[PDB]
């Protein structure tokens, strides 16, 4: 169903990463962590823009798929198609559990 | 039938309401567990000071008097 991200927003369990003891984990909805002109040498782009968190929270890998597209979808219209370079500095590792109780 | 499980948190008050935490350290702790081969001997060394009057302390008696005579000259 919906399972809105209000439920899994705080960080209230010990890390439970995808390993041999946790099978059946799906694949995260984000797969391409780098996009733009990736071959650009370090001489090229000296203005590194950051986004920094401010709450010790959890970000769903659902969001990272749409945050990557949303910021990419703008830059393409602004700079060009090989004028920038984007890297998601966060990886979804900590699988989160669900229970169907009807 | 269904019921609640335990909890354990007055374990420290009852603990120290009374209760001295030492085993009464003591001189002459009992010889319980020593090597029997070793212990047999120390039962013999005792046995040949507790037996008789002429053999052992006749040597003790002489040496003591020298301890008696030697020390007095200093005073």
């Amino acid at each position: 169903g919906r399972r809105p991200a209000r439920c899994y927003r705080y960080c209230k369990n010990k890390p439970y990463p995808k390993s041999r003891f946790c099978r059946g984990v799906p694949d995260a909805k984000i797969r391409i962590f780098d996009l733009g002109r990736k071959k650009a040498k370090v001489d090229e782009f000296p203005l590194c823009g950051h986004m920094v968190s401010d709450e010790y929270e959890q970000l769903s890998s659902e969001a990272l798929e749409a945050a990557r597209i949303c910021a990419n979808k703008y830059m393409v219209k602004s700079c060009g198609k090989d004028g920038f370079h984007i890297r998601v500095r966060l990886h979804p590792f900590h699988v989160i559990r669900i229970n169907k109780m009807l | 039938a269904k019921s609640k499980n335990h909890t354990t948190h007055n374990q420290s008050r009852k603990w120290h309401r009374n209760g001295i935490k030492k085993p009464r350290s003591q001189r002459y702790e009992s010889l319980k567990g020593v090597d029997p081969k070793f212990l047999r001997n120390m039962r013999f060394a005792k046995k040949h000071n507790k037996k008789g009057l002429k053999k052992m302390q006749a040597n003790n008696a002489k040496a003591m008097a020298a301890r008696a005579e030697a020390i007095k000259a200093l005073v």
Partner: protein
Amino acid sequence: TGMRGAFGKPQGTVARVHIGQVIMSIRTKLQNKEHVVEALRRAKFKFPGRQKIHISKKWGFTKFNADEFEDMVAEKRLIPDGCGVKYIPNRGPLDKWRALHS
């Protein structure tokens, strides 16, 4: 099932951020300051909570920083390799690196 035994089975995957962690990062030319600063706030809306946005002092994605970087590249302590720059320390047998290349 009546909650007689409720350990969840996995779904979805989440990533955690600490206060000060860096979520997303963008490289660009120095003339595209504004294109970065507002594309990120466009991305900021697909994330729970609030994230600060600022432009880094660090040249590109390198470990090294603002405009002292061009000296070392000239001084021959860094060399550009793809998306990054190698640090050339002096503990390595530079008498077998200078002998190789001054």
